[PDB]
Amino acid sequence: MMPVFHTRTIESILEPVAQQISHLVIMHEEGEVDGKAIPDLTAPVSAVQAAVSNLVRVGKETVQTTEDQILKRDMPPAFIKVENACTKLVRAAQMLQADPYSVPARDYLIDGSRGILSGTSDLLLTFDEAEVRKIIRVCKGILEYLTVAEVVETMEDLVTYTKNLGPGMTKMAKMIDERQQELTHQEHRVMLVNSMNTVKELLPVLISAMKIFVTTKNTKSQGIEEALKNRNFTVEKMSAEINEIIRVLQLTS
């Protein structure tokens, strides 16, 4: 792949093999010479088939087990792409056994290798996409609840509301902390960490903004308009941040 890989895990699995395909490209096809014999690939190529067979095994269980719908539609084509790519590798080994200098077979090696890595890439991005959708779900849930601070006019409720939004924040903070460590783009990690930090420190402020309101909302005096404008401003500010976080999570090259 030309663009940097989306995450550290994907980079770890593909980057190295992608380099090899490049070396093989430079070597044989699209490079200096290529016909000087090619040992028997039957052994290793059989190993890929097995591996591929297992990957498709695991992936299919994943399909009939996940609740995500997109994952259910997106993963299956990857099995095929991979399975079909594997077919070319087997046909290539075969040809090579008949002729070590066969170029269409060499073309098949590169083609079959690319299909497997590409199809394995789609499988990991699909899976990754499904994971980010879990984080977003959490974020939108916090968004939905933040829109509830609007009511709350009693210390009792304010304490309840607090008892609920607290763990939400803690949960969103962990996911984004760990997801951030996986990004392969500096700027994206940075943007996320800042948004999350800005949100972590606005929590105590939202709670104070709320305590302020409930109090004045229970005191026959006090200028309620002010408390309102500010509590709302704090919610408007926490929301924008969280949407920024949602936006950044879906950023891909």
């Binding site: 070396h23 190993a47 890929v48 890595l117």
Partner: peptide, 24 residues
């Protein structure tokens, strides 16, 4: 799980081994 990610790593390492035989 991480089972999916592990089997994806094998296919990769098994393919790598294939290119390694091509001295690539």
């Amino acid at each position: 799980k991480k089972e999916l990610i592990e089997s994806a790593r094998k296919v990769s390492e098994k393919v790598s081994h294939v290119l390694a035989a091509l001295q690539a």
